[PDB]
Amino acid sequence: LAGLDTAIILIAFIITAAVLAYVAVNMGLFVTQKAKTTINKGEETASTA
Amino acid sequence: LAGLDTAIILIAFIITAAVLAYVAVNMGLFVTQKAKTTINKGEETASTA
């Protein structure tokens, strides 16, 4: 009996966590590149005159 | 005397039990396959997104 309903919920919870993982990594890659670009623009702003 | 009327009732009771046996096995085969199908559809439902 219980060796099935539990397995289904496990499948669903794994997929749910994998979806957060997917989003978090993508958005970390995005934001860290925005930071890289900003740091470059800050140095350009301080240097150029 | 009694070696005949008893035999007839035995025949009838055997047939009666055999009829329940026939139905119970058929319906067990049916319902367990519905369960198999349901378990598959549950896993498909939890996995697909």
User: Using CA atoms, how far apart are residues B37 and B17, in angstroms rounded to an integer?
Assistant: 30
Q: Classify B26 as helix, strand or coil.
A: helix
Contact predicate B41/A6, CB 8 Å: no
User: Using CA atoms, how far apart are residues B37 and B43, in angstroms rounded to an integer?
Assistant: 10
On chain B, the residues whose CB falls within 8 A of the CB of A17 are none
Residues whose CB is less than 8 angstroms from the CB of residue A8 and which lie 6 or more positions away in sequence, other chains included: B42, B43, B45, B46
On chain B, the residues whose CB falls within 8 A of the CB of A15 are 46-47, 49
- The phi, psi pair for B48, rounded to 5°, reads -70, 125
The experimental technique behind this entry is cryo-EM
CA-closest candidate to residue B45, choices A4, A24, A20: A4
Q: Classify A12 as helix, strand or coil.
A: helix
* Cα dihedral B8/B14/B16/B19 (nearest 10): -140
